[PDB]
Design a protein around this motif. Structure first.
Motif, PDB file in Angstrom:
ATOM      1  N   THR A  14       8.197 -15.132   7.116  1.00  0.00           N
ATOM      2  CA  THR A  14       7.613 -13.980   6.450  1.00  0.00           C
ATOM      3  C   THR A  14       7.816 -14.093   4.940  1.00  0.00           C
ATOM      4  OG1 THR A  14       8.015 -12.621   8.404  1.00  0.00           O
ATOM      5  CG2 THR A  14       7.693 -11.519   6.355  1.00  0.00           C
ATOM      6  N   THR A  15       6.775 -13.801   4.174  1.00  0.00           N
ATOM      7  CA  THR A  15       6.918 -13.697   2.731  1.00  0.00           C
ATOM      8  C   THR A  15       6.271 -12.409   2.226  1.00  0.00           C
ATOM      9  OG1 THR A  15       6.573 -14.854   0.632  1.00  0.00           O
ATOM     10  CG2 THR A  15       4.896 -15.138   2.338  1.00  0.00           C
ATOM     11  N   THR A  16       6.846 -11.840   1.165  1.00  0.00           N
ATOM     12  CA  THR A  16       6.425 -10.546   0.619  1.00  0.00           C
ATOM     13  C   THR A  16       6.160 -10.643  -0.870  1.00  0.00           C
ATOM     14  OG1 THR A  16       7.603  -9.217   2.278  1.00  0.00           O
ATOM     15  CG2 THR A  16       7.083  -8.169   0.183  1.00  0.00           C
ATOM     16  N   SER A  17       5.041 -10.070  -1.310  1.00  0.00           N
ATOM     17  CA  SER A  17       4.736  -9.916  -2.735  1.00  0.00           C
ATOM     18  C   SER A  17       5.074  -8.495  -3.166  1.00  0.00           C
ATOM     19  CB  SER A  17       3.264 -10.181  -3.000  1.00  0.00           C
ATOM     20  OG  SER A  17       2.962 -11.467  -2.538  1.00  0.00           O
ATOM     21  N   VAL A  18       5.994  -8.364  -4.107  1.00  0.00           N
ATOM     22  CA  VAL A  18       6.356  -7.069  -4.677  1.00  0.00           C
ATOM     23  C   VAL A  18       5.486  -6.873  -5.905  1.00  0.00           C
ATOM     24  CG1 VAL A  18       8.252  -5.663  -5.581  1.00  0.00           C
ATOM     25  CG2 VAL A  18       8.657  -7.486  -3.831  1.00  0.00           C
ATOM     26  N   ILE A  19       4.515  -5.972  -5.813  1.00  0.00           N
ATOM     27  CA  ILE A  19       3.486  -5.820  -6.841  1.00  0.00           C
ATOM     28  C   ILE A  19       3.804  -4.613  -7.712  1.00  0.00           C
ATOM     29  CG2 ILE A  19       1.050  -5.595  -7.301  1.00  0.00           C
ATOM     30  CD1 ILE A  19       0.570  -6.790  -4.584  1.00  0.00           C
ATOM     31  N   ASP A  20       3.800  -4.820  -9.020  1.00  0.00           N
ATOM     32  CA  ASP A  20       3.891  -3.715  -9.963  1.00  0.00           C
ATOM     33  C   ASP A  20       2.511  -3.080 -10.052  1.00  0.00           C
ATOM     34  OD1 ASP A  20       6.654  -4.233 -10.578  1.00  0.00           O
ATOM     35  OD2 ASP A  20       6.083  -5.755 -12.014  1.00  0.00           O
ATOM     36  N   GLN A  31      -8.640  -0.265  -5.864  1.00  0.00           N
ATOM     37  CA  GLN A  31      -8.115  -0.656  -4.563  1.00  0.00           C
ATOM     38  C   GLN A  31      -9.004  -0.118  -3.449  1.00  0.00           C
ATOM     39  OE1 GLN A  31      -5.812  -2.883  -5.089  1.00  0.00           O
ATOM     40  NE2 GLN A  31      -5.645  -2.164  -7.206  1.00  0.00           N
ATOM     41  N   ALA A  32      -9.496   1.110  -3.594  1.00  0.00           N
ATOM     42  CA  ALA A  32     -10.363   1.639  -2.548  1.00  0.00           C
ATOM     43  C   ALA A  32     -11.692   0.905  -2.541  1.00  0.00           C
ATOM     44  CB  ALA A  32     -10.563   3.139  -2.701  1.00  0.00           C
ATOM     45  N   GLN A  33     -12.168   0.510  -3.699  1.00  0.00           N
ATOM     46  CA  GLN A  33     -13.387  -0.237  -3.765  1.00  0.00           C
ATOM     47  C   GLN A  33     -13.260  -1.573  -3.065  1.00  0.00           C
ATOM     48  OE1 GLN A  33     -15.335  -0.622  -7.538  1.00  0.00           O
ATOM     49  NE2 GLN A  33     -16.796   0.817  -6.698  1.00  0.00           N
ATOM     50  N   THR A  34     -12.176  -2.288  -3.286  1.00  0.00           N
ATOM     51  CA  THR A  34     -11.989  -3.567  -2.614  1.00  0.00           C
ATOM     52  C   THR A  34     -12.183  -3.437  -1.109  1.00  0.00           C
ATOM     53  OG1 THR A  34     -10.510  -4.448  -4.296  1.00  0.00           O
ATOM     54  CG2 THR A  34     -10.403  -5.405  -2.127  1.00  0.00           C
ATOM     55  N   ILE A  35     -11.672  -2.356  -0.540  1.00  0.00           N
ATOM     56  CA  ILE A  35     -11.735  -2.151   0.899  1.00  0.00           C
ATOM     57  C   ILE A  35     -13.170  -1.863   1.346  1.00  0.00           C
ATOM     58  CG2 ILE A  35     -10.772  -0.771   2.743  1.00  0.00           C
ATOM     59  CD1 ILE A  35      -8.472  -0.182   0.673  1.00  0.00           C
ATOM     60  N   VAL A  36     -13.852  -0.914   0.693  1.00  0.00           N
ATOM     61  CA  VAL A  36     -15.185  -0.550   1.183  1.00  0.00           C
ATOM     62  C   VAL A  36     -16.205  -1.611   0.812  1.00  0.00           C
ATOM     63  CG1 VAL A  36     -14.786   1.903   1.365  1.00  0.00           C
ATOM     64  CG2 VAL A  36     -15.507   0.967  -0.806  1.00  0.00           C
ATOM     65  N   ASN A  37     -16.179  -2.111  -0.427  1.00  0.00           N
ATOM     66  CA  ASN A  37     -17.112  -3.172  -0.791  1.00  0.00           C
ATOM     67  C   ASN A  37     -16.983  -4.375   0.130  1.00  0.00           C
ATOM     68  OD1 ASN A  37     -18.234  -1.785  -2.936  1.00  0.00           O
ATOM     69  ND2 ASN A  37     -16.687  -2.556  -4.373  1.00  0.00           N
ATOM     70  N   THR A  38     -15.785  -4.684   0.627  1.00  0.00           N
ATOM     71  CA  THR A  38     -15.701  -5.818   1.539  1.00  0.00           C
ATOM     72  C   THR A  38     -16.411  -5.527   2.852  1.00  0.00           C
ATOM     73  OG1 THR A  38     -13.563  -6.298   0.558  1.00  0.00           O
ATOM     74  CG2 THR A  38     -14.222  -7.549   2.516  1.00  0.00           C
ATOM     75  N   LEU A  39     -16.068  -4.403   3.490  1.00  0.00           N
ATOM     76  CA  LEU A  39     -16.690  -4.015   4.757  1.00  0.00           C
ATOM     77  C   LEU A  39     -18.181  -3.733   4.585  1.00  0.00           C
ATOM     78  CD1 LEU A  39     -13.940  -1.633   6.149  1.00  0.00           C
ATOM     79  CD2 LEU A  39     -14.466  -3.930   6.932  1.00  0.00           C
ATOM     80  N   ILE A 296      -8.247  -7.021   1.101  1.00  0.00           N
ATOM     81  CA  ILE A 296      -8.249  -5.696   1.731  1.00  0.00           C
ATOM     82  C   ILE A 296      -6.827  -5.235   1.998  1.00  0.00           C
ATOM     83  CG2 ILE A 296      -8.816  -4.482   3.846  1.00  0.00           C
ATOM     84  CD1 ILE A 296     -11.377  -6.025   4.018  1.00  0.00           C
ATOM     85  N   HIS A 297      -6.011  -6.141   2.541  1.00  0.00           N
ATOM     86  CA  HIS A 297      -4.650  -5.816   2.939  1.00  0.00           C
ATOM     87  C   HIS A 297      -3.756  -5.556   1.736  1.00  0.00           C
ATOM     88  CE1 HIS A 297      -0.507  -7.287   3.929  1.00  0.00           C
ATOM     89  NE2 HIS A 297      -0.645  -6.356   4.857  1.00  0.00           N
ATOM     90  N   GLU A 298      -3.909  -6.335   0.662  1.00  0.00           N
ATOM     91  CA  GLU A 298      -3.197  -6.021  -0.567  1.00  0.00           C
ATOM     92  C   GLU A 298      -3.632  -4.672  -1.131  1.00  0.00           C
ATOM     93  OE1 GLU A 298      -3.443  -9.154  -3.420  1.00  0.00           O
ATOM     94  OE2 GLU A 298      -2.530  -7.995  -5.040  1.00  0.00           O
ATOM     95  N   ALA A 299      -4.946  -4.430  -1.173  1.00  0.00           N
ATOM     96  CA  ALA A 299      -5.497  -3.170  -1.671  1.00  0.00           C
ATOM     97  C   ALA A 299      -5.067  -1.983  -0.818  1.00  0.00           C
ATOM     98  CB  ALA A 299      -7.009  -3.267  -1.716  1.00  0.00           C
ATOM     99  N   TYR A 300      -5.001  -2.173   0.480  1.00  0.00           N
ATOM    100  CA  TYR A 300      -4.535  -1.119   1.345  1.00  0.00           C
ATOM    101  C   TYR A 300      -3.067  -0.803   1.143  1.00  0.00           C
ATOM    102  CZ  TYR A 300      -3.150   1.302   5.519  1.00  0.00           C
ATOM    103  OH  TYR A 300      -2.601   2.176   6.390  1.00  0.00           O
ATOM    104  N   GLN A 301      -2.222  -1.817   1.003  1.00  0.00           N
ATOM    105  CA  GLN A 301      -0.793  -1.590   0.790  1.00  0.00           C
ATOM    106  C   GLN A 301      -0.495  -0.931  -0.553  1.00  0.00           C
ATOM    107  OE1 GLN A 301       1.392  -1.731   3.099  1.00  0.00           O
ATOM    108  NE2 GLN A 301       0.064  -2.737   4.584  1.00  0.00           N
ATOM    109  N   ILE A 302      -1.289  -1.205  -1.591  1.00  0.00           N
ATOM    110  CA  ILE A 302      -1.098  -0.497  -2.854  1.00  0.00           C
ATOM    111  C   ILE A 302      -1.519   0.952  -2.701  1.00  0.00           C
ATOM    112  CG2 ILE A 302      -1.790  -0.328  -5.249  1.00  0.00           C
ATOM    113  CD1 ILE A 302      -2.338  -3.401  -5.060  1.00  0.00           C
ATOM    114  N   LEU A 303      -2.705   1.158  -2.133  1.00  0.00           N
ATOM    115  CA  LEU A 303      -3.226   2.508  -1.963  1.00  0.00           C
ATOM    116  C   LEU A 303      -2.271   3.337  -1.115  1.00  0.00           C
ATOM    117  CD1 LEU A 303      -5.453   4.126  -2.719  1.00  0.00           C
ATOM    118  CD2 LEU A 303      -6.713   3.382  -0.670  1.00  0.00           C
TER     119      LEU A 303
END
Length: 437
Positions: A14-20, A31-39, A296-303
């Motif tokens: 397992t590896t984790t990115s700690v994002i500022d 972040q919400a755009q990344t999710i909807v624009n992808t789908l 999507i997963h990075e954007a979801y975890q920030i949101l």
């Protein structure tokens, strides 16, 4: 002297990115755009217990969720327009004037500059409220189809678990209150147009319109509960969050990039739950790529983290800083070889019935590395000169990697890195590596 290869067994690293990141609205909306624009744009197939999955299973997501993706896309874009008008609304904070009038040579121009700012300011408030009600209606479009009984209620997959009904209530309530004082804002807008036309144009009357416009604007821009701009932005964000919670587990990911044989697999961790991608092609109406799911997963975890830990910052705030954890995992394997003067150690592999093929090599003193095509981008060689050990870390395994692997040592120096078996002097007797898919 003897070389002893030791296998290792398949392990999960397992590896984790700690994002500022921040909780200001512009950040969260992208972040919400990344999710909807992808789908919305790539429409990955849904997996074959909720209602929409029985109907939608095996068809692209846009055939089932076209209205929900469109509704969500609209909310995010209207919420982006709310934040732009709120920055515009703050850039035209009209200023009070001395009262009664202090007439200067400069008056006429300086009153016209105050009248334009009052007009633009009231026009900005008029647009923000018009956008906030649009988001509320689009939310009904999002909330009345397949997810009607799922988004907005609360493994947690399948339910929105996003608090949208709370925010819909605070949006409608605060919108009605701003509607209750549109009289006083029209009083100010026509007061500006008459002043431009060039009593009811006294300084007292001007400062009254100006003070009215600033108070409504301060609540619209700086508030939370009583701001329909704030509640509309928050509903946009919470709707995209709930949308992903309601159906996102059902998107097929792991689409192949170029050739059908390269088994990229990655698991994405949620909080606990895991989604696997890979275990065929990535394209519209079929699958998402790993990189696409990564985003999507990075954007979801920030949101998710921003809203839960600090909430949305007031639209004219600049936002608390915060750390989001983005955790993924992939299967890996470590081979090791221990020795009982060396210039180079390498790893070779032999599929049953085939010649030994070079895999990866390391200069013994400096630790410089040289890799075969099979190892390029997946395998890593290293050496412990103290323990007289070489290592082969094998990531993203594929069935074509099944072989006996052998470590080898070369005792004399060289110019071209040695890649042929006859350029090595010592050999272990091999460890079997099997991989199945």
């Amino acid at each position: 002297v003897q070389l002893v290869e030791s296998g290792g067994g398949l392990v999960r690293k397992t590896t984790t990115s700690v994002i500022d990141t921040t909780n200001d609205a512009q950040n969260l909306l992208t972040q919400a755009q990344t999710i909807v624009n992808t789908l919305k744009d790539y429409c990955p197939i849904l997996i074959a217990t909720p209602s929409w999955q029985t109907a939608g299973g095996g068809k692209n997501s846009c055939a089932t969720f076209g209205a929900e993706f469109s509704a969500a896309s609209d909310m995010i874009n209207n919420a982006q327009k709310i934040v732009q008008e709120t920055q515009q609304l703050s850039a035209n904070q009209p200023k009070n004037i001395t009262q009664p009038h202090n007439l200067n040579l400069n008056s006429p121009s300086s009153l016209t500059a105050l009248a334009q700012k009052m007009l633009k300011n009231a026009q900005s408030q008029a647009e923000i409220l018009k956008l906030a009600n649009q988001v509320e209606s689009d939310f009904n479009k999002l909330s009345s189809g397949h997810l009607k009984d799922y988004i907005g209620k609360c493994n947690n997959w399948g339910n929105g678990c996003a608090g949208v009904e709370e925010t819909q209530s605070l949006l409608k309530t605060s919108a009605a209150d701003f509607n209750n004082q549109t009289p006083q804002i029209n009083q100010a807008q026509n007061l500006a147009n008459t002043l431009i036309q060039e009593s009811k144009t006294s300084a007292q009357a001007i400062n009254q319109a100006v003070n009215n416009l600033n108070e409504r604007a301060k609540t619209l821009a700086g508030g939370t509960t009583n701001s329909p701009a704030y509640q509309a932005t928050l509903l946009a964000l919470r709707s995209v969050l709930g949308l992903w919670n309601s159906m996102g587990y059902a998107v097929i990911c792991g689409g192949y990039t170029k050739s059908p044989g390269e088994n990229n697999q990655k698991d994405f961790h949620y909080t606990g739950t895991t989604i696997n991608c890979g275990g065929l092609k990535a394209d519209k109406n079929v699958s998402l790529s790993i990189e696409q799911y990564e985003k999507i997963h990075e954007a979801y975890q920030i949101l998710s983290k921003a809203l839960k830990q600090a909430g949305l910052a007031p639209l004219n705030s600049k936002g608390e800083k915060l750390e989001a954890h983005v955790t993924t995992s992939k299967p890996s394997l470590r081979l090791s070889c221990a020795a009982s003067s060396t210039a180079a150690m390498g790893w070779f592999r032999q599929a049953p019935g085939k010649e030994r093929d070079f895999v990866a090599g390391i200069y013994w003193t400096v630790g410089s590395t040289y890799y075969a095509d099979s190892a390029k981008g997946r395998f890593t060689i290293s050496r412990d000169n103290a323990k007289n050990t070489v290592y082969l870390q094998m990531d993203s395994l594929k069935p074509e990697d099944t072989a006996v692997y052998y470590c080898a040592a070369r005792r004399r120096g060289f110019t071209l890195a040695p890649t042929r078996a006859n350029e090595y002097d010592y050999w272990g007797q091999g460890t079997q590596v099997t991989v199945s898919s």
